[PDB]
Amino acid sequence: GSHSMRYFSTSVSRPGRGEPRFIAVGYVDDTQFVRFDSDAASQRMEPRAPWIEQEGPEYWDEETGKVKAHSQTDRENLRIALRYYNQSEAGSHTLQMMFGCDVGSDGRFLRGYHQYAYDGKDYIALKEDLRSWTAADMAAQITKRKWEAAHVAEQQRAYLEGTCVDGLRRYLENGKETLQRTDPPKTHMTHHPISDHEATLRCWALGFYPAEITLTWQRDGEDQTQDTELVETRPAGDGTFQKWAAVVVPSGEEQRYTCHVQHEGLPKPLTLRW
């Protein structure tokens, strides 16, 4: 059980029609636990997972503090952005940020992240060593100079290796029953004739957590990586996930194909046969 904590933030300017839209969410693994929305009436950081509600009014105040501050910083970042590339104040622009830390099973620091996108393209990110940034263009160069001059990294490195992961453990302990159990996929296969010369095998996986999953289709034991319709994994909307995989099969050959399923909630990987 490797684990991750992530925050995502999006700010979208509305030239003319108000301040930027700002939306922030947090995740332990594929479970969202908190959200901020500037448009919502509550104007606080809000819970989205039963267990984070254990936290005191202290935590709510301070988290609201920070997400609020960040949203203001975004407002200015959007303004600065236009200035850097000389863009119209009439266009709508999007500003995104990811932050988090990864721990292994023992609970110890693996990885830390802090990266940004402007208009959906990489802008600036903290390198893996956590001591320098990677800047995607000349605008982001300027941002980087400031950040080195300001010695921002020394703070981020420490925060990630220190407080981020400490926060990760504590959430994992608190939201135990939920975050630490792993739900396995209920699997099955369906058959859908489409002509007199061909039929469709579709392999399902349902009710699984976490979202990480591999569906693979074989013929005679030979991989079929090329001839396989695969859907992007998708949430049930009850905290589980779903995926499926499909192959067009020459009528009479259904028995030549097998379906393979890997998921860390399965002791053994599965072979499914029609």
Partner: peptide, 8 residues
């Protein structure tokens, strides 16, 4: 715990 962050 949400991050502290800095101006571009």
């Amino acid at each position: 715990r949400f991050p502290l962050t800095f101006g571009w």
